């Protein structure tokens, strides 16, 4: 699936991410735009033998198990497949988890490079949340 700005905007909100530990909904809708094009399926390998997965592109190192990475430390106990799904429960849940360690959203590059400190309200304007 490929979400429509507003779509995702709301489903996030429904997944309790609006102000999830300090970060306005905008930051989510944004970080997924730039980081996966709102495409649950997106996948991009990290030269480093790792792989990315889904909407917030969770990594194959410290977050899920692809069985193609050995260092592999599944902080999120989820089989990466689970992140490719139509259902972002998986993805959110682990996000809710990453974002809990002082690097918060800095864990997300696109967010750090192109999202971060922009009027993010943007991302959630025009929507029917």
């Amino acid at each position, epitope marked *: 699936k490929v979400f429509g700005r507003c779509e995702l905007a709301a489903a996030m909100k429904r*997944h309790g991410l609006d*102000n999830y530990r300090g970060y306005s909904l905008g930051n989510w809708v944004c970080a997924a735009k730039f980081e996966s094009n709102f495409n649950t399926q997106a996948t991009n390998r990290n030269t480093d033998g790792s792989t990315d997965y889904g909407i917030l592109q969770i990594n194959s190192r410290w977050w899920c198990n692809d069985g193609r990475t050995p260092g592999s*430390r599944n*902080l999120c106990n989820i089989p990466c497949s689970a992140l490719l799904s139509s259902d972002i429960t998986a993805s959110v*849940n682990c996000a809710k988890k990453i974002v809990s*360690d002082g*690097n918060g959203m800095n864990a997300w590059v696109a967010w750090r490079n192109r999202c971060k400190g922009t009027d993010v309200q943007a991302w959630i304007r025009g929507c029917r949340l």
Partner: antibody
Amino acid sequence: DVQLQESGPSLVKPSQTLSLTCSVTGDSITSDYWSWIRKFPGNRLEYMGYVSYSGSTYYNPSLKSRISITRDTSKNQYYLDLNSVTTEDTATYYCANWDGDYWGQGTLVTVSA
Amino acid sequence: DIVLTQSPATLSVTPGNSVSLSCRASQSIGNNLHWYQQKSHESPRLLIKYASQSISGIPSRFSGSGSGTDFTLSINSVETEDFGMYFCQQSNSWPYTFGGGTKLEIKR
């Protein structure tokens, strides 16, 4: 599978310092986010703070700045260190992991003169 | 910090009846309210995550719902093995705060 077993003293003098530990065995510690939670006499639970991958720490303001959670990766365990102990600090301290997927027996701790 | 108000205090219920515990957070804390169970002589256990996300290996009798302020967990067709206490915990904001608890008693 994964087992966490808190250890330390039974009692320390007020305004002394209590140090506990939570040897984690079986599963790895390398980064899973761990915590400390206390259950007081009135049966109400209170979260102390936690240790997230990195060495990012957060701590319940309720608990002044008397705390200092920390870990030892070679020795797979992590500790707890409540400084300037006091009466109220009398409760049972437990160690968890992020959510509370896993827990430990708990260990009773008295702060009496 | 942020409070959660667990109502009712106690509940004495008759094996096979349906009950329901509430937990009101004084904040929007949308969706991150999780329930644990602490059965006499032990360390809690997680029942339901986020709000309605049931943990695995827990009875189908347990059901949770809500988001916003008003949050509830329902025990359907109670069982004698359901005597214990139930607390709620938000993880939306720091510090993570627990609820007053609710001692569900089994009518013998």
